[PDB]
Amino acid sequence: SNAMTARYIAIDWGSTNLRAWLYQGEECLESRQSEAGVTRLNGRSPAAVLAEITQHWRDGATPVVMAGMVGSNVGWKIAPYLPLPAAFSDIGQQLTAVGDNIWIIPGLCVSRDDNHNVMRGEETQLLGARALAPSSVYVMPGTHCKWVLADRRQIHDFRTVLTGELHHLLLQLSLVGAGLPPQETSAAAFAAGLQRGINNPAVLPQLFEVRASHVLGALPREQVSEFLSGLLIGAEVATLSDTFAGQQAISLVAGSSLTSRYQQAFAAIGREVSAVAGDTAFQTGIRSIAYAVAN
Amino acid sequence: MTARYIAIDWGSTNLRAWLYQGEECLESRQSEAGVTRLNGRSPAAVLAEITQHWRDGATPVVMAGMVGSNVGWKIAPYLPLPAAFSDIGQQLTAVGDNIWIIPGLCVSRDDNHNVMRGEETQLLGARALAPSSVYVMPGTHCKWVLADRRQIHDFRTVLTGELHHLLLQLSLVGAGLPPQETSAAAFAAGLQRGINNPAVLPQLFEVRASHVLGALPREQVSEFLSGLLIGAEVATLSDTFAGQQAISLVAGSSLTSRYQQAFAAIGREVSAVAGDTAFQTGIRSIAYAVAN
């Protein structure tokens, strides 16, 4: 029978935001959002919150497929990590059942002497990127950036870099950014940071120099955020690029602003990327799981 | 035969003062009136109160730290490097009669922008008490200094203490952890990981993954992270600040121990001097140059 005529509900349930979509095939019939992330439920059960946000959408036959922190230990029910290497096709065959045709997508893990790593949520965008922009290497930037090695059937390995988080920590909570004025866009400061980070993957001494540079007048006070961003992204790409080698274009999975920052970083070290929007990758990935459940 | 002087360490949140006659500390005092917590008092009034009954015509006050920053009493501009160790006591900033502020140091060239204010005074002490070509001064902001017998040539700063605190207590790494415990083993393991990964950025998240997956006890995260950051620091800078003489490590007793272990893991000798002893010997050498 034809899965494209099947209704399904896609959920992305984070620690602080909840997004829900009702789909029929590639048609998004309705979408809803709530501030009721899993650590912000304000005393309600996850089951009650899901029923509220899917009100008038449910009808017995319609599966609910959920990604993200809803399957963590602070979520509804633990969906245990799948250890790597794992087939792309394992994800959709290993869903955690929470009752009544409601399913949680598990994250992925790696556990060996030289690599301990987890992801939860990004596997769903990965599945989408595998359909939309296949590669041996996927880079998925954000607060935490995932770099993933895969072939056409299996996900082999990944690493995580705290780029967005560290930018936040350094600019807004640390002495590096203390006392700065409102921050402005600067293509030149970003480009200069990028060059500095690319040449200093062993980046630790460079962090304080961002502050000293603005104190001594070599970096305008309004351009610190942009310089810091370039430094961290540059150091990230120089650290991992030769370890995530590939003839094929890295497939870069992110929103449009951050895509173009990483494209610029990759161009400064001579690497080609194919870009796929994070939201498109998410929905294509979720859909692949919903079609398995409705098969 | 020996100099009478008053030594001040005046930080953002704390003030300490000592009356000395040569090496004899006659009296010490402390106050919560850091230069950002004056509570509407003038710095001059805070200093008058803390030096009450100590003052005479011939007794200079020598002050280090944030008192000489742009949020302090009066700016003691940074001395650009290279500078002779002896240049520091000849370029004090006067704020009043025989009251002097010690200036920090800076470097400003294409591949190095750096500042310090406070640590130069410890450095002057360490130059007398454990001379070396390389001084490492750990803390919130670790200073690594290159110098010869006469001149301070260069320095770098690593935010080891600040980054440790932020990543443990202000970020998703240490979110959800129980109270943290001492662990020689977790520190030693972090050290090995950091020494082998100076390009440390991917390793930071793996500390959190390590505890999620049961490879690192939830209560030993602080210790592992400490080893990781210190190990990465030392592997980043050791070959750049090379030298045959023992690195002169200037720190309190906890950090001294961590850094000794970090340097021993990469085969590098260390001569330790306590940071408080270094500070006092440093301030003393300046007071003696003022008294003349």
The answer to whether A199 touches A167, Cβ cutoff 8 Å, is no
Residue type at position A186:
S
DSSP tag of A151:
-
In degrees to the nearest 10, what's the CA dihedral of B50, B51, B54, B58? 170
DSSP code per residue over chain B:
---EEEEEEE-SS-EEEEEEETTEEEEEEEES--TT--TT--HHHHHHHHTTTT--TT--EEEESGGGSTTSSS--PPEESSEEGGGGGGSPEEEETTEEE---EEEEETTEEEEESSHHHHHHHHHHHS--SEEEE-STTEEEEEE-SSEEEEEEEE-HHHHHHHHHHSSSSSTT-------HHHHHHHHHHHHT-SS-HHHHHHHHHHHHTTSS-GGGHHHHHHHHHHHHHHHHHTTTS--SSPEEEEE-HHHHHHHHHHHHHTT--EEEEEHHHHHHHHHHHHHHHHH-
In degrees to the nearest 10, what's the CA dihedral of B212, B217, B222, B224? -90
Which residues have CB under 8 Å from B233's CB, separation 6+? A204, B142, B158, B160, B194, B262
Could you give the C-alpha distances from A124 to A131, A286, A292, in angstroms and in order?
Answer: 11, 6, 14
Say if the Cβ atoms of A204 and B159 lie within 8 Å. yes
The answer to whether A207 touches A171, Cβ cutoff 8 Å, is no
Whether chain A has a CB inside 8 Å of the CB on B158: the answer is: yes
Whether chain A has a CB inside 8 Å of the CB on B93: the answer is: no
DSSP tag of A141:
-
Q: Which one of B109, B116, B155, B205 would you mutate to disrupt binding with A, by most A Cβ within 10 Å of its Cβ?
A: B205
Mode of pairing for the β-strands spanning B83-84 and B112-116: unpaired
Whether chain A has a CB inside 8 Å of the CB on B172: the answer is: yes
Q: At what angle do helices B253-265 and B184-195 cross, to 10 degrees?
A: 50
In the numeric block, the tokens 């309705």 are attached to: A30
Residue type at position A253:
V
Give the helix/strand (H/E) hosting A238: helix A224-240
> Could you say which of A160, A161, A208 has the minimum Cβ distance to residue B159?
A208
> Could you say which of A215, A218, A239 has the minimum Cβ distance to residue B201?
A239
Say if the Cβ atoms of B199 and A109 lie within 8 Å. no
Strand, coil or helix: what is A247? coil
> Could you say which of B113, B201, B229 has the minimum Cβ distance to residue A216?
B113
Which residues have CB under 8 Å from B160's CB, separation 6+? A204, B138, B141, B142, B229, B230, B233
Query: In chain A, which among 36-75 make CB contacts under 8 A with chain B?
Result: 74
Which residues have CB under 8 Å from A201's CB, separation 6+? A235, A238, A239, B199, B201
The answer to whether B260 touches B107, Cβ cutoff 8 Å, is no
> Could you say which of A109, A176, A218 has the minimum Cβ distance to residue B108?
A218
Nearest CA distance, A17 vs chain B (angstrom): 17
DSSP tag of A14:
-
Say if the Cβ atoms of A175 and B167 lie within 8 Å. no
Q: What's the fold here for domain A80-94+106-295?
A: Nucleotidyltransferase; domain 5 (3.30.420)
Token pair of A259 as six digits: 């895509």
Backbone φ and ψ for A215, nearest 5 degrees, come out as: -60, -40
**For residue B229, which residues of chain A lie inside 8 Å, CB to CB?**
204
Specify which residues B143 forms β-bridges with.
B137, B157
**For residue A141, which residues of chain B lie inside 8 Å, CB to CB?**
none
Query: Rounded CA gap, B259 and B160, in Å?
Result: 11
> Could you say which of A116, A208, A216 has the minimum Cβ distance to residue B213?
A116
Specify which residues B61 forms β-bridges with.
B6, B99
Superfamily of domain A1-79+95-105, CATH level 4: 2-keto-3-deoxy-galactonokinase, substrate binding domain (3.30.420.300)
Query: In chain A, which among 180-199 make CB contacts under 8 A with chain B?
Result: none
Q: Which one of A74, A116, A168, A228 would you mutate to disrupt binding with B, by most B Cβ within 10 Å of its Cβ?
A: A116
Query: Rounded CA gap, A164 and A148, in Å?
Result: 18
**For residue A204, which residues of chain B lie inside 8 Å, CB to CB?**
158-160, 163, 198, 200, 229, 232-233, 236
The answer to whether B8 touches B68, Cβ cutoff 8 Å, is no
In terms of residues, how long is chain A? Answer: 295
Query: Rounded CA gap, B156 and A265, in Å?
Result: 26
> Could you say which of B171, B198, B212 has the minimum Cβ distance to residue A169?
B171
Residue type at position A137:
V
Maximum distance among all alpha carbons in chain A?
69
- For chains A and B, CB pairs below 8 A equal 119
In terms of residues, how long is chain B? Answer: 292
Specify which residues B6 forms β-bridges with.
B19, B61
Domain boundaries, chain B: 2-76+92-102, 77-91+103-292
Specify which residues B118 forms β-bridges with.
none
Q: How was this model experimentally determined? A: X-ray
B77-91+103-292 — its CATH code? Answer: 3.30.420.310
Superfamily of domain B2-76+92-102, CATH level 4: 2-keto-3-deoxy-galactonokinase, substrate binding domain (3.30.420.300)
Say if the Cβ atoms of B163 and A207 lie within 8 Å. yes
Q: At what angle do helices A187-198 and A256-268 cross, to 10 degrees?
A: 50
Q: A1-79+95-105 and A80-94+106-295 share one CATH topology?
A: yes
Query: In chain B, which among 109-148 make CB contacts under 8 A with chain A?
Result: 112-115, 140-141
Whether chain B has a CB inside 8 Å of the CB on A151: the answer is: no
